[PDB]
UniProtKB/Swiss-Prot annotation:
Transmembrane segments: none annotated. The keyword Repressor does not apply. The potent mast cell activator mastoparan-7 (abbreviated Mas7 or M7, which contains Ala at position 12 (K12A) and an Ile at position 13 (L13I)) can be used as a mucosal adjuvant to produce an anti-cocaine vaccine to induce an immune response that could attenuate the effects of cocaine consumption in humans. In mice, this preparation induces the production of high-quality neutralizing antibodies, reduces cocaine penetration of the blood-brain barrier and protects mice from its psychoactive effects. InterPro entries: Mastoparan (IPR013213). It comes from Vespula lewisii (Korean yellow-jacket wasp). This is Mastoparan-L.
């Protein structure tokens, strides 16, 4: 699943 990866990737670009 690649959905969970987005939750940390989202924080990276904050």
């Amino acid at each position: 699943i690649n959905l969970k990866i987005l939750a940390r990737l989202a924080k990276k670009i904050l």
